[PDB]
Design a protein around this ligand. Structure first.
Ligand SMILES: NC(=O)c1ccc[n+]([C@@H]2O[C@H](COP(=O)([O-])OP(=O)([O-])OC[C@H]3O[C@@H](n4cnc5c(N)[nH+]cnc54)[C@H](O)[C@@H]3O)[C@@H](O)[C@H]2O)c1
Ligand SMILES: NC(=O)c1ccc[n+]([C@@H]2O[C@H](COP(=O)([O-])OP(=O)([O-])OC[C@H]3O[C@@H](n4cnc5c(N)[nH+]cnc54)[C@H](O)[C@@H]3O)[C@@H](O)[C@H]2O)c1
Ligand SMILES: O=C(O)CCC(=O)C(=O)O
Ligand SMILES: O=C(O)CCC(=O)C(=O)O
Lengths: 318, 318
């Protein structure tokens, strides 16, 4: 009969503006993923970059209906990403919540890098690199700083020079004790990063393998940024879901990659079925496609926190 | 920034409680379907009958997220079907509406039978048969009576004897000039129907070919009711989307059916690319899987009608 509506402001008020709830949710989500206690159908892409993608899954059940188009910050002064998340009571399959998706999507994706870095980043890394200063990049940086205490330098690059400058400026004001560096190109930023996170909207790869320091960990969030050579030269390659990944497909289609060469799925690192980083020289690549269970678990946790604090707008269905 | 929320009551107030708006919407939708001016990805089923199914499509863009489970009227006194429809501005892919789905879903499905019967039912048919007295069956009957003036008898069967009796009683009160007949079994109901509509929730087929009158048209809405023999013995077999249909797949997988044997897709009848019924003896079977474009077009039309009358709850996204 009733559904709770939670806009971005309600989500922020409920605690969705901090990484810890997303870390807990994904730790739960990825654990269930490693034990196959999920139902995650292949996402259909609705295309007229420019796309709308339905991400349904069961762990709670639900779906993320997130739209995107590149023209947005450029032409219409709107965020690229936008959409809604529906939560369903598995006992009933009736919808129980309608929630804004973009903030949750960005924070959970930031939590992916956090959990992965916990297992894959080198010990006592100090230099963090952020490529792309959009909503994703901002949340990636926010979450890393909240979860890792001794991040000392942050290298930032964005194709948009003003977007990068504005990004660096306000973050330098938020954390005056941390040295934020605005780089002239991607190479400088990547070269100086012990942990590298890609948060761009490109189709063509640019990150070369020799840019990466020994012992570096790269969280390839935006996926397309990384050259094929990194997949074959990295000491360890980690994905979220192998079946989902099949850029890797063509490497498998060609005589260049396979599941046997894959180190682990992210859920296996969490459960401790497979070790993470095993020495300080290893270059490790994370290639997450994003999973619907990550959004549903996150939204569900936030939904509960909102209800406990009586946050949100109650809607009637009939 | 803003979305319009339309619950079932708002949808009814906006005019979504009558067939004509759905007929117009699907006529537009099916016309676009016949010219391939759509993007309709294969629906993923989320299964823990018991299912939740994501139906995204572009014509307007959007998705129907409709949940179902059989236990509902039986155990928890709730409707089997429930869910939401999201509408998206293709220029922006931003969501512009959140709408209740079950009423729209049932009415558009009722419109499918209407439009098909317009092309496939015999001239001056008087006897209508409804198998299944759920929300679907009620809307099927309502729409047929609104769209066809001289329906004289309505044969009704349901496994639930009380649900059928209650169905027949109140409909007999709504239309005292029409003779509603409560049958003891499916065979009597089907045997006496010039137009037969299946609206049940079964897994096993029961409708035999020899039950069907010469010149009869069967709208197999609930799909599973019809024996394989009807597909191969019917003079004309019509579907909504052939690629979607692949019960037909196994017939194709076996040496029993193919696309060449298929008469037409429903959109082709609407555009007049392919003739409908061509004589009074032909037994014609419609096997619609349901298409997302049918829901999105319907919801969009209703969305506009609601806005013109200022109906609904305005929600903020941020
Ligand atoms: N893997 C996942 O699970 C996941 C989840 C959510 C989003 N994403 C991705 O995150 C990416 C960025 O999202 P967003 O920040 O919100 O979009 P955005 O707000 O448009 O930010 C993109 C920014 O990247 C900048 N950029 C830097 N280098 C390049 C380059 N070489 N080419 C093009 N642009 C460049 C660009 O200037 C722009 O400001 C998208 O590509 C999404 O696909 C991934
Ligand atoms: N083809 C489409 O596009 C489309 C769209 C929407 C719904 N549907 C189908 O419509 C069907 C019915 O929906 P609903 O009426 O809302 O559900 P419902 O409200 O549960 O009604 C089902 C009724 O069918 C009755 N019934 C009669 N004969 C049988 C039988 N042999 N086995 C089982 N039940 C029987 C049963 O008693 C029950 O009352 C579902 O199976 C849906 O899949 C199809
Ligand atoms: O923001 C987007 O473009 C959608 C990304 C996403 O949901 C995913 O695929 O993980
Ligand atoms: O009510 C249901 O079970 C969903 C039916 C539906 O949306 C379809 O497949 O056409």
């Amino acid at each position: 009969r009733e559904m709770l509506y939670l806009n971005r402001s309600d989500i922020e008020q409920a605690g969705g503006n901090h990484s810890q709830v997303y870390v807990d949710a994904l730790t739960e989500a990825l654990t269930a993923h490693a034990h196959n206690d999920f139902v995650q159908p292949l996402k259909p892409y609705l295309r007229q970059a420019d796309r709308i993608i339905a991400m349904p899954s069961h762990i709670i059940s639900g779906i993320k209906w997130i739209g995107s188009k590149h023209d947005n910050p450029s032409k219409r002064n709107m965020e690229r990403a936008s959409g809604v998340i529906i939560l369903n009571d598995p006992e009933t399959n009736y919808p129980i919540a309608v929630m804004e998706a973009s903030l949750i999507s960005s924070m959970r994706t930031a939590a992916v890098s956090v959990i992965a870095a916990k297992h894959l980043a080198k010990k006592g890394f100090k230099d963090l690199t952020i490529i792309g200063c959009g909503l994703i990049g901002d949340k990636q940086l926010q979450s890393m700083l909240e979860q890792f205490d001794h991040i000392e330098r942050v290298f930032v690059y964005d194709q948009f020079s003003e977007a990068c400058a504005r990004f660096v400026d306000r973050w330098q004001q938020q954390r005056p004790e941390i040295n934020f560096i605005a780089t002239e190109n991607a190479k400088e930023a990547v070269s100086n990063g012990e942990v590298v996170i890609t948060c761009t909207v490109t189709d063509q790869p640019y990150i070369e393998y020799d840019w990466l320091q020994k012992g570096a960990f790269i969280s390839n969030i935006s996926i397309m940024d990384v050259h094929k050579e990194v997949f074959i030269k990295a000491d360890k390659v980690v994905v979220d879901d192998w079946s989902q990944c099949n850029t890797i497909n063509q490497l498998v289609l060609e005589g260049k990659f396979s599941k046997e060469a894959l180190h682990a799925e992210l859920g296996q690192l969490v459960t401790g079925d497979i070790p993470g980083r095993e020495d300080d020289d290893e270059i490790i690549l994370l290639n997450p496609m994003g999973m619907a269970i990550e959004d549903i678990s996150s939204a569900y946790f936030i939904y509960q926190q909102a209800q406990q604090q009586n946050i949100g707008t109650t809607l009637n269905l009939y």
